[PDB]
Amino acid sequence: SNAMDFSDDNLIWLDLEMTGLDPERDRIIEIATIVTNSHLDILAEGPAFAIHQPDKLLTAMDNWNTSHHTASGLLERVKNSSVDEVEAETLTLAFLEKYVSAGKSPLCGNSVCQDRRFLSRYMPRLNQFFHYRHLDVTTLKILAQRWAPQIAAAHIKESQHLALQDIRDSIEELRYYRAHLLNL
Template sequence: MIVKHPKANGSQSMSLTRILMEIMMVASNNNVNNENLIWLDMEMSGLLPDSDRILELAAVVTDANLNVLGESPVFVIHQSDAVLDGMDAWNKGAHGRSGLIDKVKASTTSEQMATEQMIAFLKEHVPAGKSPMCGNSICQDRRFMARYMPELESYFHYRNLDVSVFKELARRWKPEIYAGFKKASRHEALADIYESIDELKYYREHFIVK
């Protein structure tokens, strides 16, 4: 809202509006950085992109030092009863306990709608093609994204930043460090992202030689 001084004319009011818009654009652009990292997690109905579908996704943006800069909405994707009924026992149990199955049935969000809104969020923080896709076993999420959300997949750099690499190396080289990080594994997109960020912070402190 623009508060207009009683003596201000129309041109002065428009000038003030333009100044405020420019200030907002500069502030927004200051958040965009090539070095920012996009962390992502999906929950799926199974492991096979050709037959299973995306149920939920979310993203968190951090700076290069893993400080959180922004958090996307959690997108729950509507899927048919046939998709949900076709899940195996493990997925039905995990997604039933978390309440995700009921959320999927109630959702009106499609893959395309989620794609458009997620890209709009990412543009506020990272230019296209700059951030690797960050997360745990993130190649699996990327396979589903390439299949069902190709526009979103192409927003990322072709590289991945997979925390699972550090996990597997620690398990073989430093099992005591591997044992020191306990995961809750809630199988909820946003919670799992923050757990991945915390896990990389742990390995940065205890495993990566400075």
């Protein structure tokens, strides 16, 4: 035995920032991951990468995205990034291999289908690294809004639209529902 954090029971949390909502025509501009155990304890935070994209593309973003990504400082980190999809993927992969094996953990986060659709198109290896299933906190959010609005309203999230920050919020949100929405 040893005290290393590896285990196939471990959960992988991942968030992305994109130039838009269309996985076929938009790109990934940021990636972050966090590994927790099944009890939601953070074991290690993964690398956070601004992913370089050609400026001609970044200037074809709508107002909402140019506003948010400039504001958060992400657009600047992107212009000065020497990391493309493959390198981010590889490094992320090397990190995740330490805590859990391939296809073991579901994709964990908030509204992660969109992420799954970008991963599938731009990061096939990392995408395949996840189990087919998803652990989406947003589902708990919906149920809290419909069935226990006072519970949902007690955990207001203010997203900074930065991957590492958002992943941290996703975990905290799940921890919250476990205590206040779940029968355990």
